Design a protein around this ligand. Structure first.
Ligand SMILES: CCCCCCCC/C=C\CCCCCCCC(=O)O[C@H](COC(=O)CCCCCCCCCCCCCCCCC)COP(=O)(O)O[C@@H]1[C@H](O)[C@H](O)[C@@H](O)[C@H](O)[C@H]1O
Length: 307
């Protein structure tokens, strides 16, 4: 499969329980877990990386990991995640036309990688006017956009970033810019955040690498206690709400040349009149690292900025 064509072992510098870094008991658990799933007629998504994500998510409790995996496989079928990329491509023009309507008001863009090679993903929320947004999208449409991205991440971004790094890259580095948000608006969208958290926690285990929140209102750290019940403590431990010294904090994790100027770095788009909210720059655009999966589709259509 495509998995044979990029590295499937993590760096030796990675966390415990990751591919290539297992203890003997963890290796034995992985073999037992795979054996159980094969005996239950599963054939897909049984690679080391996937299965160890599920095992780590349940602290190597095999039966709990089986339940989580069984529930994920059925969810993928019920929701349409297994065909979401193909379905998008079969209606690409109409879907891109609608997606671009959201982009300026709600920037969502990958831009290069962190120091360890993870895809680096930015969102900016301070330009959202909720009344205006809900004229051009629905909550469940935004949720499906996010699932489609999770599938693009796994299908295109992981392979390219892994080939670049020479080791398996399984996780994302997120920077969420909250400059200008209202905490009452945040409260009003808590049900959407819960929907995002439920799908992400239950069906996309161990995909989060690091999650920085910048420019948040003074009261955001305590408002965030309303989100924590939707998240596991492991996930919370990867979320860092940064203060006024955030630029240098990001630079511990991200090469300066990969970070936009406005967030402390030196990265500028090749045409400086282009907009980050139409951009999708990173190793998945480098022909050296694009493999037999082919190149990622361009989610902003003819407006997509790839340099
Ligand atoms: C409607 C518009 C508003 C959108 C405003 C909300 C927009 C949503 C904000 C950010 C979306 C981007 C998040 C993308 C997540 C990608 C990675 C991912 O899927 O990670 C997965 C988890 O992803 C999530 O939980 C997603 C939710 C993250 C918290 C979202 C924070 C949002 C708080 C700031 C928003 C408030 C400002 C709003 C302002 C609104 C202004 C109008 C897997 O986690 P991980 O730790 O790797 O493994 C888990 C495993 O899974 C569990 O089983 C185990 O029990 C546990 O031990 C671990 O093994």
């Amino acid at each position: 499969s495509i998995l044979d064509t990029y590295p499937q072992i993590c760096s030796p510098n990675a966390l415990p329980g990751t591919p290539g870094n297992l203890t003997k008991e963890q290796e034995e658990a992985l073999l037992q877990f795979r054996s159980i799933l094969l005996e239950k007629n599963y054939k897909e998504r049984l690679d080391d990386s996937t299965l160890l994500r599920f095992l780590r998510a349940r602290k190597f409790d095999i039966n709990a990991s089986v339940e989580m995996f069984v529930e994920t496989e059925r969810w993928r079928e019920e929701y349409g995640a297994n065909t979401i990329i193909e379905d998008y491509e079969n209606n690409k023009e109409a879907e891109d036309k609608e997606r671009i309507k959201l982009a300026k008001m709600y920037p969502q863009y990958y831009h290069h990688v962190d120091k360890d090679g993870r895809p680096l993903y930015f969102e900016e929320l301070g330009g959202i006017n909720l009344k205006k947004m809900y004229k051009i999208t629905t909550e469940k449409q935004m949720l499906r956009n996010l699932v489609k991205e999770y599938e693009l991440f796994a299908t295109y971004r992981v392979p390219a970033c892994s080939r670049r790094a020479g080791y398996l890259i399984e996780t994302i580095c997120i920077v969420l810019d909250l400059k200008g948000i209202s905490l009452s608006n945040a409260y009003h969208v808590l049900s959407y955040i819960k929907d995002v958290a439920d799908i992400s926690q239950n069906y996309y285990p161990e995909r989060m690498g690091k999650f920085y929140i910048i420019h948040s209102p003074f009261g955001f750290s305590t408002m965030f206690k309303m989100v924590k019940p939707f998240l596991d403590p492991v996930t919370v431990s990867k979320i860092f709400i940064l203060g006024s010294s955030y630029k240098k904090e990001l630079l511990k994790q991200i090469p300066i040349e990969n970070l936009p100027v406005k967030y402390g770095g030196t990265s500028v788009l090749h045409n400086p009149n282009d907009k980050f909210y139409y951009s999708d720059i990173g190793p998945w655009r480098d022909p050296r690292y694009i493999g037999p999966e082919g190149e990622i589709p361009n989610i902003f259509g003819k407006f997509t900025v790839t340099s």
